[PDB]
Design a binder for these strands. Structure first.
Lengths: 89, 250, 200
RNA sequence: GCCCCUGAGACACCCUGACGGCCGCCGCCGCCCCGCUCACCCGGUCGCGCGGGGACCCGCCCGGGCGGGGAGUUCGGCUGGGGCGGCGCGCCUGCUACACCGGACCGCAGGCGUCCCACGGCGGGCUCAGCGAGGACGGAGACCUCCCGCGGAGCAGAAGGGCACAAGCCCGCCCGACCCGCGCCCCCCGUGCCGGCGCGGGCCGCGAAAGCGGGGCCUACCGAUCCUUCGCCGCCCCGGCCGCG
RNA sequence: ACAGCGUCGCGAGGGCCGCACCCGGCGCUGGCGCGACGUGAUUUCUGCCCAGUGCCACGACCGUCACCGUGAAGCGAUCCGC
RNA sequence: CCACGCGCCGCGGCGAGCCCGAGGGAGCCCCCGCGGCGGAGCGAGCGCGAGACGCCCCGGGCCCGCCAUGCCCCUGCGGGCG
RNA sequence: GGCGGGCCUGAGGCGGCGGGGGCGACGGGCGGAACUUAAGCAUAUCAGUACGCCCCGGAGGAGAAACCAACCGGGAUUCCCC
């Protein structure tokens, strides 16, 4: 396969590079995404997904998102992010 | 592997239009503020002969609206035009033979030449020698006058189209046989280099699709589809019914 | 299915049911049901499994089966009926459910046929060799040409909804022998001559 | 009124399902039809006194045709020249073949490209085509008898071998016309491939048994790599891991 | 070749061609026009055939017959439907 | 003819070894100088992995893998022994 | 309508300064063959070559990881040995 077989692999101690001080969007990046979303509005592909959710539930909503965004992981996030707008009107 | 005579025709050079010595284009008066509200008069300077077009060309000058000098415009001559005739032309110009007026104002059944396909096209349909158009009805339903084209189709033009009352002069031109082929060499000496023509079954096979077999047979049916490749369309194009039938009238 | 919702309503048409007062699990129910997506060229023909059944024997029935139910009849007891063949061609007039003997059926083999093929069944297995009435389950989900069909509710004279399990016995089955397993079904409603009920 | 009694089928016992039908009902989707000008495309002029189209075309992106008008090729072989009239171009029987075997030919006399779960396997019985001589109708001729019956019969078809308490014929069963691993012979470079043959094991059949059987008495009746399809137990995905591939 | 003779397409927002696109030629033209054709001056006539094979039909929409689109279904690569 | 790949063959050095590689060295023909090729095979892969003889040569017999299979059993559709 | 200012998108002229073309190699970007090979030929192959085109330098291009690796791990590019 892709690993050699040494039952006792490990003869030197290993330090794990990790986190690199794992950060966040921080206050400004999110705030700005609010400033623009407020004036410009939602894109048409997004509008269809939200409208699918008030009536249909998921399934076909994800299917439109896979075609428009091109990958399920981006689509699963997009369907979920879009849903927050859906449960109000 | 060589293109047919039709293919080389549009290349230009040799197979082009001889236009030298031709006096110029035949067009009506420019439609304008004076023509729209009134009529401008015009003397007939001369009725010259075009080199290329058998049809007489008539030079008529009108008073230029702005500059003092008179502008000269060449009109296809309507039969009955006389040197010194004053063609009164405009929206309010009468139906006396030779005037240029909005087809809508012209009454039903009139004989018209040089009708315009769309408003102010400066001359379009019915220019050939001896040809004419008739207003079947000046219908006001959509400001559209009916026109019977010389060929006889029924088309419509916007009432604001303009034309000359009277048949295009020079009629009966093709009745006389051309006779001696030389009259044909001279006739086409003012037109395209389309004379003399070589038939399809005569040419060797590398040149024409009809080509030549052992016995000069067309080889297949002349009717060739409308949507055929440029090189293929050499036979009768899209025939709806070949042959000679009950005359041509049904 | 809503086991909690309207699956506890199987006794809901209480004194509303009346309708001849048959005496059973209140409303007749019968769980009106239909098949969606079933095609003529599909794949569901077979049988497999208050009350109206009849069984009989000569080697113990008068006490083992007839005492407390059924009827007092031997392996024959028709005679001129086994020659006229009228009532048997449509046994529903006579034997409402057909279980006429097991292990003693040898006596009738000589003169039998048109009614038992018309009715479709006669000698099913309940006999004096077994304690008679141990197999009282003559009950029936039949499928092939028609829809889900209004098949038996599950009896359950017991009150409340122990029949919810029997309603689910039909649910445990039915999805069997269907092209779209459980998807190929169209109606989930409860109504019959009983009276006013609700969707399951 | 009824499982009153009668049909393939209560219909008075209310719910379904079917097709029509449809009030009408859709935060649904396809499709058209008409405006309007504000892109876009036309025509007038010396932009000196304006018109015509119109969200349409067009371009462009895939998609479905049609398309020697173009290209690029290919157009087998043998063979008393070519010869494509024939196929001896793979295969088999009997010759030719000159007594081991091997021996040529658009040389002769012919076939093969299939057919049959019985036309197979096995066990049992049986004797066949017919020479006669007899017997209602009944004679070349149909059947039923004996008798003598070396095969003169039939065994799916070419021909030649071969066969008689059978390899023919009938019956009773039954799947051996099965799997796992091999060798040998035939063509032969002693390579393939078809066709057999001889075995090591498994498992069944048939018969009391010994035996016999991986087809049809033998010699003809068929298929490389690649690729698809599929069967059986598994193995692999490469940094892991789990399902689907 | 040829006059004659017929057939054929077309109303220019169009026919028929050039050309890699740009964009030309027919056309300083407009159906007595321009292409596409066969036949070959008149005199005298041109029969019979639509089966095919061509062509032609805002002739039909029956059968097939695409990308779209979009019904399900599956976790999704997909997969069936119209 | 020259190049480089290959298959044998004859030599020369050395031997489970052997190797002027690119390079570095005040050196040029001299000194130092790896990957490589062997030393172990077989199996599609998981992977697993040769002793027992013999002047040579030929067989024979065995052992290793890939297969089947019978037993025994540990740490276990794992190991052993046939 | 007139007139004058600021901004903005433009129109000529002036001043300074660049830019164009050449070189039989090397170099960077395209456009792009066929003969040939497969004993024929279509996919292949020749070949990401001839030739056409544009551009630069004394070298250019490339270059400081959205990188290989899976190890008791490396560390921009460029070249060379394998």
């Amino acid at each position: 396969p892709g690993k050699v077989f040494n039952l006792k692999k490990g003869g030197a101690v290993v330090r794990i590079v990790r986190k690199k001080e794992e950060r966040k969007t921080k206050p400004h990046q999110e705030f700005v995404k609010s400033i623009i979303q407020e004036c410009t509005g939602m894109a048409p592909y997004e509008m269809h997904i939200i409208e699918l959710l008030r009536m249909n539930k998921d399934r076909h909503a994800l299917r439109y998102a896979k075609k428009r965004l091109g990958n399920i992981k981006r689509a699963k996030a997009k369907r979920d992010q879009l849903s927050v707008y859906a449960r109000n009107i | 592997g060589r293109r047919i005579r039709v293919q080389r025709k549009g290349a230009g050079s040799v197979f082009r239009a001889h236009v030298a010595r031709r006096l110029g284009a035949a067009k009506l008066r420019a439609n304008d503020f004076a023509e729209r509200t009134g009529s401008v008069r015009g003397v007939v300077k001369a009725i010259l002969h075009d080199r290329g077009r058998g049809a007489p060309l008539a030079r008529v000058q009108f008073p230029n609206m702005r500059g003092e000098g008179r502008v000269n415009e060449l009109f296809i001559a309507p039969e009955g035009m006389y040197t010194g005739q004053e063609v009164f032309s405009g929206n309010k110009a009468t139906l006396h033979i030779g005037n240029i007026l909005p087809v809508g104002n012209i009454p039903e059944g009139t004989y018209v030449c040089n009708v315009e396909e769309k408003p102010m096209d400066r001359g379009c349909l019915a220019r050939a020698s001896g040809t004419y158009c008739l207003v079947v009805a000046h219908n006001m339903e959509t400001n559209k006058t009916r026109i019977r084209l010389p060929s006889g189709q029924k088309k419509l033009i916007s009432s604001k189209a303009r034309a000359m009352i009277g048949l295009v002069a020079g009629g009966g031109r093709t009745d006389k046989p051309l006779l001696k082929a030389g009259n044909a060499y001279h006739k086409y000496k003012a037109k395209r280099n389309c004379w003399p023509v070589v038939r399809g079954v005569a040419m060797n096979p590398v040149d024409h699709p009809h080509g030549g077999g052992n016995h000069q047979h067309i080889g297949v049916s002349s009717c060739v589809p409308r949507n055929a490749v440029p090189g293929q369309k050499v036979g009768l194009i899209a025939a709806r019914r070949t042959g000679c039938s009950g005359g041509k009238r049904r | 299915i809503n086991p909690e919702a309207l699956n506890k309503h199987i006794a809901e048409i209480i004194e509303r049911a009346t309708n001849e007062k048959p005496r059973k699990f209140l409303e007749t129910v019968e769980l009106q049901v239909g098949l969606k997506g079933y095609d003529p060229k599909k794949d569901p023909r077979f049988n497999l499994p208050n009350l109206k059944l009849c069984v009989i024997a000569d080697a113990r029935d008068a006490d083992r089966a007839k005492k407390l139910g059924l009827n007092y009849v031997e392996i024959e007891h028709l005679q001129q009926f086994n020659k006229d063949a009228k009532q048997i061609k449509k046994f529903a007039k006579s034997y409402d459910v057909f279980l006429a003997s097991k292990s003693l059926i040898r006596q009738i083999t000589v003169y039998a046929g048109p009614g038992f093929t018309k009715a479709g069944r006669t000698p099913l297995p309940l006999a004096p060799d077994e304690d008679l009435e141990l197999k009282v389950l003559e009950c029936k989900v039949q499928f092939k040409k028609a829809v889900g069909l209004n098949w038996p509710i599950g009896n359950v004279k017991m009150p409340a909804s122990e029949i919810a399990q029997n309603i689910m016995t039909t649910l445990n089955f039915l999805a069997t022998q269907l092209k779209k397993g459980w998807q190929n079904i169209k109606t989930v409603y409860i109504k019959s001559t009983m009276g006013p009920s609700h969707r399951i």
